């Protein structure tokens, strides 16, 4: 069920695109591992950097409670 | 109570009592020294002091060898101390996990 697949062409450096980005967060809000995003090394680094900027802006969470 | 055997040797009540005095070093650990037995013997190369003692947590069995009888009695005591202390503290060894 790798995320990279379930999306079309997108910008990895685009930090305002919350709708794309928010899919790479665990339901707890954490940045997802390479094994779940299907990203390579080089791309995954660009991801994490722009997710972090995004949380700074208010668009993405730093943490989310776990519901059951 | 404490019993001493002198095998193929003549020993004095003095030497006997000196053994009681060295053995008391074991009372340090504060546990019941039950029917301790000391055996003294003269091998070709020096004297031998053997002892067998039961305590609530086990048995002390050990033997000293030295050209000098007094020195062997002491080496006996060391071996006995080490065993007795190993008895008294080995149980504490695994309170975690």
């Amino acid at each position: 069920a790798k995320v990279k697949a379930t999306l079309g062409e997108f910008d990895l450096r685009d930090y305002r695109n919350v709708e794309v980005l928010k899919r790479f967060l665990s339901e707890t809000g954490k940045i997802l591992p390479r094994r779940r995003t299907g990203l390579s090394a080089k791309e995954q680094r660009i991801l994490a950097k722009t997710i972090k900027r995004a949380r700074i802006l208010g668009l993405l969470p730093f943490t989310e409670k776990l519901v059951r | 109570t404490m019993n001493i055997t002198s095998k193929q040797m003549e020993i004095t009540p003095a030497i006997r009592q000196h053994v009681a005095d060295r053995l008391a070093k074991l009372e340090k650990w504060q546990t019941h020294l039950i029917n301790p037995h000391i055996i003294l013997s003269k091998e070709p190369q020096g004297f031998v002091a053997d002892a067998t003692i039961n305590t609530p947590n086990g048995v002390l069995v050990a033997s000293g060898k030295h050209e000098d009888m007094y020195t062997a009695i002491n080496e006996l005591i060391n071996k006995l101390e080490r065993q007795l202390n190993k008895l008294q503290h080995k149980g504490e060894a695994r309170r975690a996990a």
């Binding site: - | 504490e92 309170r95 975690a96 996990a97």
Partner: protein, 155 residues
């Protein structure tokens, strides 16, 4: 023991009731392999429990057995630096044994002078939930109940 489980010995039924259990309980009355005497005392007791209570030895005895069966017990297991009393369910084999052992034991703590009487009585009292044997079961059962907290520590 170490290799495979133990096999419960099948007892020979008693010739006054054909009952596997009266056998076992006889045996627990037996000192020094003197089984005949052990039967006498038992059977004598039954005579008594018939006389003093007009109903069946067998029916009575079998109750005082069910009433002394411990359902739970504590068995010890050192964890860390404490010896915990763990609560455990008792297998019916052990339940029986305990019941029989205790019945005899409780009875032999009684003051009446003749072995036959004491048995008769302990059984009477236990069929009615009274007496040392039942008291052993409750102590044992309370003990296990109290230690309910350590139930997950069980093997």
């Amino acid at each position: 023991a170490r290799r495979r489980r133990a096999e419960v010995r099948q007892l020979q039924p008693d010739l006054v009731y054909g009952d596997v259990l009266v056998t076992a309980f006889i045996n627990k009355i037996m000192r020094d392999g003197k089984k005949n005497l052990a039967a006498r005392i038992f059977y004598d007791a039954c005579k008594i429990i018939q006389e003093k209570t007009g109903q069946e030895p067998l029916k009575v005895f079998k109750q005082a057995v069910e009433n002394v069966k411990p359902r739970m017990e504590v068995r010890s297991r050192r964890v860390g630096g404490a010896n915990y009393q763990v609560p455990m369910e008792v297998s019916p084999r052990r339940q029986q044994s305990l019941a029989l052992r205790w019945l005899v034991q409780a009875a032999n703590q009684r003051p009446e002078r003749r072995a036959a009487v004491r048995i008769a009585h302990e059984l009477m009292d236990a069929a009615e939930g009274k007496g040392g044997a039942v008291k052993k079961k409750e102590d044992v059962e309370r003990m296990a109940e109290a230690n309910r907290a350590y139930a997950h520590y069980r093997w």
